[PDB]
């Protein structure tokens, strides 16, 4: 081993240790909103169906408790 | 003899068509009879001849 190789390696290390990094927060901030609406939009179909069929409001809830001929 | 069903306002199964809930049976027997009354009056007359 010599000093030339070691110095060249040290210089190349510092050279590589200079890559810039741009922002990456707005991407996730927008992806979260693009998914929230896509997930909570389809409920309007069920709401309109329940309001136009015959049953009144209030009884319309969320979860997984089966269904019947009165509550949705 | 006769039978009648019982049903309250829409209930059971959360339906809305008035379902049956009970029943009430009625029995009995008819009877007929006739009667004829008759009352005759008579006057008594006693004496003691000698």
Coordinates of N, CA, C and O in Angstrom, one line a residue:
Chain A
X1 N 0.8 -1.2 0.0 CA 0.0 0.0 0.0 C 0.9 1.3 0.0 O 2.0 1.3 0.6
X2 N 0.4 2.3 -0.6 CA 1.1 3.6 -0.7 C 0.1 4.7 -0.3 O -1.1 4.5 0.0
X3 N 0.6 5.9 -0.3 CA -0.2 7.1 0.0 C -1.0 7.6 -1.1 O -2.1 8.2 -0.9
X4 N -0.6 7.3 -2.4 CA -1.4 7.8 -3.5 C -2.8 7.2 -3.6 O -3.8 7.8 -3.7
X5 N -2.8 5.8 -3.4 CA -4.1 5.1 -3.5 C -5.0 5.6 -2.3 O -6.2 5.8 -2.5
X6 N -4.4 5.7 -1.1 CA -5.2 6.0 0.0 C -5.8 7.5 -0.1 O -7.0 7.7 0.2
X7 N -5.0 8.4 -0.6 CA -5.4 9.8 -0.8 C -6.5 9.8 -1.9 O -7.5 10.6 -1.8
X8 N -6.3 9.1 -3.0 CA -7.3 9.0 -4.0 C -8.6 8.5 -3.5 O -9.7 9.0 -3.9
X9 N -8.6 7.4 -2.7 CA -9.8 6.9 -2.1 C -10.5 7.9 -1.2 O -11.7 8.0 -1.2
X10 N -9.7 8.6 -0.4 CA -10.3 9.6 0.5 C -10.9 10.7 -0.3 O -12.0 11.2 0.1
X11 N -10.3 11.1 -1.4 CA -10.9 12.1 -2.2 C -12.2 11.7 -2.9 O -13.1 12.4 -3.0
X12 N -12.2 10.5 -3.4 CA -13.4 9.9 -4.1 C -14.5 9.8 -3.0 O -15.7 10.0 -3.4
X13 N -14.2 9.4 -1.8 CA -15.2 9.3 -0.8 C -15.9 10.7 -0.5 O -17.1 10.8 -0.5
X14 N -15.1 11.7 -0.4 CA -15.6 13.0 -0.2 C -16.4 13.5 -1.4 O -17.4 14.2 -1.3
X15 N -15.9 13.1 -2.6 CA -16.7 13.5 -3.8 C -18.0 12.8 -3.8 O -19.1 13.5 -4.1
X16 N -18.1 11.5 -3.6 CA -19.4 10.8 -3.5 C -20.3 11.4 -2.4 O -21.5 11.4 -2.5
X17 N -19.7 11.8 -1.3 CA -20.4 12.4 -0.2 C -20.8 13.9 -0.5 O -20.5 14.8 0.2
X18 N -21.5 14.0 -1.6 CA -22.0 15.4 -2.1 C -23.3 15.3 -2.9 O -23.7 16.4 -3.4
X19 N -23.9 14.2 -3.0 CA -25.1 14.1 -3.7 C -26.3 14.8 -3.0 O -26.5 14.6 -1.8
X20 N -27.0 15.7 -3.7 CA -28.1 16.4 -3.1 C -29.3 15.5 -3.0 O -29.4 14.5 -3.6
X21 N -30.2 16.0 -2.1 CA -31.5 15.3 -1.9 C -32.6 16.3 -1.9 O -32.6 17.2 -1.1
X22 N -33.6 16.1 -2.8 CA -34.7 17.1 -2.8 C -35.8 16.7 -1.8 O -35.6 15.8 -1.0
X23 N -36.8 17.5 -1.8 CA -37.9 17.3 -0.9 C -38.7 16.1 -1.3 O -38.8 15.7 -2.4
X24 N -39.4 15.5 -0.3 CA -40.2 14.3 -0.5 C -41.3 14.2 0.5 O -41.8 13.1 0.8
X25 N -41.8 15.3 1.0 CA -43.0 15.3 1.9 C -44.3 15.6 1.2 O -45.3 15.0 1.5
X26 N -44.3 16.5 0.2 CA -45.5 16.8 -0.5 C -46.1 15.6 -1.2 O -47.3 15.5 -1.3
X27 N -45.2 14.7 -1.6 CA -45.7 13.5 -2.3 C -46.6 12.7 -1.4 O -47.7 12.3 -1.8
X28 N -46.1 12.4 -0.2 CA -46.9 11.6 0.7 C -48.1 12.4 1.2 O -49.2 11.9 1.4
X29 N -47.9 13.7 1.4 CA -49.1 14.6 1.8 C -50.2 14.5 0.8 O -51.4 14.6 1.2
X30 N -49.8 14.5 -0.5 CA -50.9 14.4 -1.5 C -51.4 13.0 -1.7 O -52.6 12.8 -2.0
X31 N -50.6 12.0 -1.5 CA -51.0 10.6 -1.7 C -52.0 10.3 -0.6 O -53.0 9.5 -0.8
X32 N -51.8 10.8 0.6 CA -52.8 10.5 1.7 C -54.1 11.1 1.4 O -55.2 10.4 1.6
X33 N -54.2 12.3 0.9 CA -55.5 12.9 0.5 C -56.1 12.2 -0.7 O -57.3 12.1 -0.8
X34 N -55.3 11.8 -1.6 CA -55.8 11.1 -2.8 C -56.4 9.7 -2.4 O -57.3 9.3 -3.1
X35 N -56.0 9.2 -1.3 CA -56.6 7.9 -0.8 C -57.8 8.1 0.1 O -58.7 7.3 0.0
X36 N -57.7 9.2 0.9 CA -58.8 9.4 1.8 C -60.1 9.6 1.1 O -61.2 9.0 1.4
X37 N -60.1 10.5 0.1 CA -61.4 10.7 -0.7 C -61.8 9.5 -1.5 O -62.9 9.2 -1.6
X38 N -60.8 8.8 -2.1 CA -61.1 7.6 -2.9 C -61.7 6.6 -2.0 O -62.5 5.7 -2.5
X39 N -61.4 6.6 -0.7 CA -62.0 5.6 0.2 C -63.4 6.0 0.8 O -64.2 5.2 1.0
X40 N -63.5 7.3 1.0 CA -64.8 7.8 1.7 C -65.8 8.4 0.7 O -66.8 9.0 1.2
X41 N -65.5 8.3 -0.6 CA -66.5 8.8 -1.6 C -67.6 7.8 -1.8 O -68.8 8.2 -1.9
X42 N -67.3 6.5 -2.0 CA -68.4 5.6 -2.4 C -69.6 5.5 -1.5 O -70.6 5.0 -1.9
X43 N -69.4 6.0 -0.2 CA -70.6 5.9 0.7 C -71.8 6.7 0.2 O -72.9 6.5 0.7
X44 N -71.6 7.7 -0.6 CA -72.7 8.5 -1.1 C -73.7 7.6 -1.9 O -74.9 7.9 -1.8
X45 N -73.2 6.6 -2.6 CA -74.1 5.7 -3.3 C -75.1 5.0 -2.3 O -76.3 5.0 -2.5
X46 N -74.5 4.4 -1.2 CA -75.4 3.8 -0.2 C -76.3 4.8 0.5 O -77.4 4.5 0.8
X47 N -75.8 6.0 0.7 CA -76.6 7.0 1.4 C -77.8 7.3 0.5 O -79.0 7.4 1.0
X48 N -77.6 7.6 -0.8 CA -78.7 7.9 -1.7 C -79.6 6.8 -1.8 O -80.9 7.0 -1.9
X49 N -79.1 5.5 -1.9 CA -80.0 4.4 -2.0 C -80.9 4.3 -0.8 O -82.1 4.0 -0.9
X50 N -80.3 4.4 0.4 CA -81.1 4.3 1.6 C -82.1 5.4 1.8 O -83.2 5.2 2.3
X51 N -81.8 6.6 1.3 CA -82.7 7.8 1.4 C -83.8 7.7 0.3 O -84.9 8.3 0.5
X52 N -83.5 7.1 -0.8 CA -84.5 7.0 -1.9 C -85.4 5.7 -1.8 O -86.5 5.7 -2.3
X53 N -84.9 4.7 -1.1 CA -85.7 3.4 -1.0 C -87.0 3.7 -0.2 O -88.1 3.5 -0.7
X54 N -86.8 4.0 1.1 CA -88.0 4.3 1.9 C -87.6 4.5 3.4 O -88.2 5.3 4.1
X55 N -86.5 3.8 3.8 CA -86.1 4.0 5.2 C -85.6 5.4 5.4 O -85.1 6.1 4.5
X56 N -85.8 5.9 6.7 CA -85.4 7.3 7.0 C -84.0 7.3 7.4 O -83.3 6.3 7.4
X57 N -83.5 8.5 7.7 CA -82.1 8.6 8.1 C -81.8 8.1 9.6 O -82.6 7.4 10.1
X58 N -80.7 8.6 10.2 CA -80.4 8.2 11.5 C -80.0 6.8 11.6 O -78.9 6.5 12.0
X59 N -80.9 5.9 11.2 CA -80.6 4.4 11.3 C -79.4 4.1 10.4 O -78.8 3.0 10.7
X60 N -79.0 4.9 9.5 CA -77.9 4.6 8.6 C -76.6 4.7 9.5 O -76.3 5.8 9.9
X61 N -75.9 3.6 9.6 CA -74.7 3.6 10.4 C -73.5 2.9 9.7 O -73.7 2.6 8.5
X62 N -72.4 2.7 10.4 CA -71.2 2.1 9.8 C -70.9 0.8 10.7 O -71.4 0.7 11.8
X63 N -70.0 0.0 10.1 CA -69.6 -1.2 10.8 C -69.8 -2.4 10.0 O -69.9 -2.4 8.7
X64 N -70.0 -3.6 10.7 CA -70.3 -4.9 10.0 C -71.2 -5.6 11.0 O -70.8 -6.5 11.7
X65 N -72.5 -5.3 11.0 CA -73.5 -5.9 11.8 C -74.7 -6.4 10.9 O -75.8 -6.3 11.3
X66 N -74.3 -7.0 9.8 CA -75.4 -7.5 8.8 C -76.3 -6.4 8.5 O -76.1 -5.2 8.7
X67 N -77.4 -6.7 7.8 CA -78.5 -5.8 7.4 C -79.8 -6.4 7.5 O -79.9 -7.7 7.7
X68 N -80.9 -5.6 7.4 CA -82.2 -6.1 7.4 C -83.1 -5.2 6.6 O -82.6 -4.3 5.8
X69 N -84.4 -5.3 6.7 CA -85.4 -4.5 6.0 C -85.8 -3.2 6.7 O -87.0 -2.8 6.6
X70 N -84.9 -2.6 7.4 CA -85.2 -1.4 8.2 C -84.0 -0.5 8.4 O -84.0 0.7 8.1
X71 N -82.9 -1.2 8.8 CA -81.6 -0.5 9.0 C -80.6 -0.9 8.0 O -80.6 -2.0 7.4
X72 N -79.7 0.1 7.7 CA -78.6 -0.1 6.7 C -77.3 0.0 7.4 O -77.0 0.9 8.2
Chain B
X1 N -117.0 -24.1 17.1 CA -115.6 -24.0 17.2 C -115.1 -23.0 16.2 O -115.6 -22.9 15.0
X2 N -114.1 -22.2 16.6 CA -113.6 -21.2 15.7 C -112.2 -20.8 16.2 O -111.9 -21.0 17.4
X3 N -111.4 -20.2 15.3 CA -110.0 -19.8 15.6 C -109.8 -18.4 15.0 O -110.3 -18.1 13.9
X4 N -109.0 -17.6 15.7 CA -108.7 -16.3 15.3 C -107.2 -16.0 15.6 O -106.7 -16.5 16.6
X5 N -106.6 -15.3 14.7 CA -105.2 -15.0 14.8 C -105.0 -13.6 15.5 O -105.9 -12.8 15.6
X6 N -103.8 -13.4 16.0 CA -103.4 -12.2 16.8 C -102.2 -11.6 16.1 O -101.2 -12.3 15.9
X7 N -102.2 -10.3 15.9 CA -101.1 -9.6 15.3 C -101.1 -8.2 15.7 O -102.1 -7.5 15.7
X8 N -99.9 -7.7 16.2 CA -99.7 -6.3 16.7 C -99.1 -5.4 15.6 O -99.0 -5.9 14.4
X9 N -98.8 -4.2 15.9 CA -98.2 -3.3 15.0 C -96.8 -3.9 14.4 O -96.3 -4.9 15.0
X10 N -96.3 -3.4 13.3 CA -95.1 -4.0 12.7 C -94.0 -4.2 13.7 O -93.4 -3.3 14.2
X11 N -93.6 -5.5 13.9 CA -92.5 -5.9 14.8 C -91.9 -7.2 14.3 O -92.4 -7.7 13.3
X12 N -90.9 -7.7 15.1 CA -90.3 -8.9 14.8 C -89.6 -8.9 13.4 O -90.1 -8.5 12.4
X13 N -88.3 -9.2 13.4 CA -87.4 -9.3 12.2 C -87.2 -7.9 11.6 O -86.7 -7.8 10.5
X14 N -87.6 -6.8 12.3 CA -87.5 -5.4 11.9 C -88.2 -5.3 10.5 O -87.7 -4.5 9.7
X15 N -89.3 -6.0 10.3 CA -90.0 -5.9 9.0 C -91.0 -4.8 9.1 O -91.1 -4.0 10.1
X16 N -91.8 -4.6 8.1 CA -92.9 -3.6 8.0 C -94.0 -4.1 7.2 O -94.4 -3.6 6.1
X17 N -94.7 -5.2 7.7 CA -95.8 -5.8 7.0 C -96.8 -6.4 7.9 O -97.7 -7.1 7.4
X18 N -96.7 -6.1 9.2 CA -97.6 -6.7 10.2 C -97.6 -8.2 10.2 O -98.3 -8.8 9.4
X19 N -96.7 -8.8 11.0 CA -96.6 -10.3 11.1 C -97.5 -10.8 12.2 O -97.9 -10.1 13.1
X20 N -97.7 -12.1 12.1 CA -98.6 -12.8 13.1 C -97.7 -13.0 14.4 O -96.5 -13.3 14.3
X21 N -98.4 -12.9 15.5 CA -97.7 -13.1 16.8 C -98.4 -14.2 17.7 O -97.7 -14.8 18.5
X22 N -99.7 -14.4 17.6 CA -100.4 -15.3 18.4 C -101.7 -15.8 17.8 O -101.9 -15.5 16.6
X23 N -102.5 -16.4 18.6 CA -103.8 -17.0 18.1 C -104.7 -17.2 19.3 O -104.2 -17.4 20.4
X24 N -106.0 -17.2 19.1 CA -107.0 -17.4 20.1 C -108.1 -18.3 19.5 O -108.7 -18.0 18.5
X25 N -108.3 -19.5 20.2 CA -109.3 -20.5 19.8 C -110.5 -20.3 20.6 O -110.4 -20.0 21.8
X26 N -111.7 -20.5 20.0 CA -113.0 -20.4 20.7 C -113.8 -21.6 20.4 O -113.9 -22.1 19.3
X27 N -114.4 -22.2 21.4 CA -115.2 -23.4 21.3 C -116.6 -23.1 22.0 O -116.8 -22.0 22.6
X28 N -117.4 -24.1 22.0 CA -118.7 -24.0 22.6 C -119.7 -25.0 22.0 O -119.3 -25.9 21.2
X29 N -120.9 -24.9 22.4 CA -122.0 -25.9 21.9 C -123.3 -25.2 22.1 O -123.6 -24.6 23.1
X30 N -124.2 -25.3 21.1 CA -125.5 -24.7 21.1 C -126.5 -25.8 21.5 O -126.3 -26.9 21.3
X31 N -127.6 -25.3 22.2 CA -128.6 -26.2 22.7 C -129.9 -25.5 22.6 O -130.1 -24.3 22.8
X32 N -131.0 -26.3 22.3 CA -132.3 -25.8 22.1 C -133.3 -26.7 22.9 O -133.1 -27.9 23.1
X33 N -134.3 -26.0 23.5 CA -135.3 -26.7 24.3 C -136.6 -26.0 24.2 O -136.6 -24.7 24.0
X34 N -137.7 -26.7 24.4 CA -139.0 -26.1 24.4 C -139.8 -26.6 25.7 O -139.4 -27.6 26.3
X35 N -140.8 -25.8 26.1 CA -141.6 -26.1 27.3 C -143.0 -25.6 27.1 O -143.2 -24.6 26.4
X36 N -143.9 -26.4 27.6 CA -145.4 -26.0 27.5 C -146.0 -26.2 28.9 O -146.0 -27.3 29.4
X37 N -146.5 -25.0 29.4 CA -147.1 -25.0 30.7 C -148.6 -25.0 30.6 O -149.2 -24.5 29.6
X38 N -149.3 -25.7 31.5 CA -150.7 -25.8 31.6 C -151.2 -25.7 33.0 O -150.8 -26.5 33.8
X39 N -152.1 -24.8 33.3 CA -152.7 -24.7 34.6 C -154.2 -24.6 34.5 O -154.7 -23.8 33.8
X40 N -154.9 -25.5 35.2 CA -156.3 -25.6 35.2 C -156.8 -25.4 36.6 O -156.3 -25.9 37.6
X41 N -157.9 -24.5 36.7 CA -158.5 -24.1 37.9 C -159.8 -24.9 38.2 O -160.5 -25.3 37.2
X42 N -160.0 -25.3 39.4 CA -161.2 -26.1 39.8 C -161.7 -25.6 41.2 O -160.9 -25.3 42.1
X43 N -163.0 -25.4 41.3 CA -163.6 -24.9 42.5 C -164.2 -26.1 43.3 O -164.9 -27.0 42.7
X44 N -163.9 -26.2 44.6 CA -164.4 -27.3 45.4 C -165.8 -26.9 46.1 O -166.0 -25.7 46.3
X45 N -166.6 -27.9 46.3 CA -167.9 -27.6 47.0 C -168.2 -28.8 47.9 O -168.4 -29.9 47.4
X46 N -168.2 -28.6 49.2 CA -168.4 -29.6 50.2 C -169.8 -29.4 50.8 O -170.4 -28.3 50.7
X47 N -170.3 -30.4 51.5 CA -171.6 -30.4 52.2 C -171.7 -31.6 53.1 O -170.9 -32.5 53.0
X48 N -172.7 -31.5 53.9 CA -173.0 -32.6 54.9 C -174.5 -32.8 55.1 O -175.0 -32.2 56.0
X49 N -175.1 -33.5 54.2 CA -176.5 -33.8 54.2 C -176.9 -34.9 55.2 O -176.1 -35.8 55.4
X50 N -178.1 -34.8 55.8 CA -178.5 -35.9 56.7 C -180.0 -35.9 56.8 O -180.7 -35.3 56.0

